[PDB]
């Protein structure tokens, strides 16, 4: 009935100043702003959900316009709650500053 995930923003790729590695993304999870608070989210699955034009099949339902790129949280980043994430395919650059759902079912509690 309600919402079962947590908001994150796809801030950007793991990068230096002149090089960027697109195989690792940086997520800003809402509400967590320090390293001693990000150990909860380590290993949780994350999803980038977006609409498209063509219909695609969905598990346990009729086809619709929704598509998803899956991934998982790997490790903390920085000192301010930033999180490193790895997805099965590198996220498109058009998702910079957009919503990624981090879920809870890879649970350890």
């Amino acid at each position: 009935s309600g919402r079962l995930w947590c908001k994150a923003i796809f801030a950007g790729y793991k990068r230096g100043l002149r090089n960027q590695r697109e195989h690792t993304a940086l997520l800003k999870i809402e509400g967590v702003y320090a390293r001693d608070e990000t150990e909860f989210y380590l290993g949780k699955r994350c999803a980038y959900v977006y609409k498209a034009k063509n219909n695609t099949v969905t598990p346990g339902g009729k086809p619709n316009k929704t598509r998803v790129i899956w991934g998982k949280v790997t490790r903390a980043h920085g000192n301010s709650g930033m999180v490193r994430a790895k997805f099965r395919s590198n996220l498109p650059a058009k998702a910079i500053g957009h919503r990624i759902r981090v879920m809870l079912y890879p649970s350890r509690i």
Binding site: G2, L4, C6, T38, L104, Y105, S107, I109
Partner: protein, 216 residues
Amino acid sequence: KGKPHCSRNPVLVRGIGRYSRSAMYSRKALYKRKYAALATVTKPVGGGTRVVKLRKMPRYYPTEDVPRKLLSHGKKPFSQHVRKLRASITPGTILIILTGRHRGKRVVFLKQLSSGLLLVTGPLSLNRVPLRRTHQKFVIATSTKIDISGVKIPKHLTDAYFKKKKKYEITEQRKVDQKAVDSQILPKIKAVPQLQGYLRSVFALTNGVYPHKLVF
């Protein structure tokens, strides 16, 4: 011959015994345990008798074949894997299903099954979930428990019972088992005030609350 005795040393740590070699030589009493030095069947036929050879040669060898594999030791089939359970999960605990069709429904937990799946049920009279299996990873175990140490669940229910077959029709055996379990579960949860409504409700996340902050 000889009855198989148990191991003479308790496991101190995995792979290390409590007693040393000499202590074992003493405890086993080995000082007085010294020791010193198909493919054919004959059948009658109505002629005479024929020596039929079972395990006969194949009538077709393939163009080419793969070689054998090297031997490895630490790999075991899923049947005899050691089963682990989270410390926070004990019989009579409330869980929150996170991924099934019953998303975020508070459900009572009863028993760990043989293959590692949790046998779970919140009495479908109030939260509408039957006897079911659920993976222990995909559930949140809150720190609210009831006492179900004094309830009996049938021994016939198991993973073979819950295994999918093949439209799915519920069986009368399923109905009677669910009734038998819930007739004992329900009075226990009705003793605790405001617990039936809690199980009826559905967990959700609103803005301003974060799982890493909130405790359960």
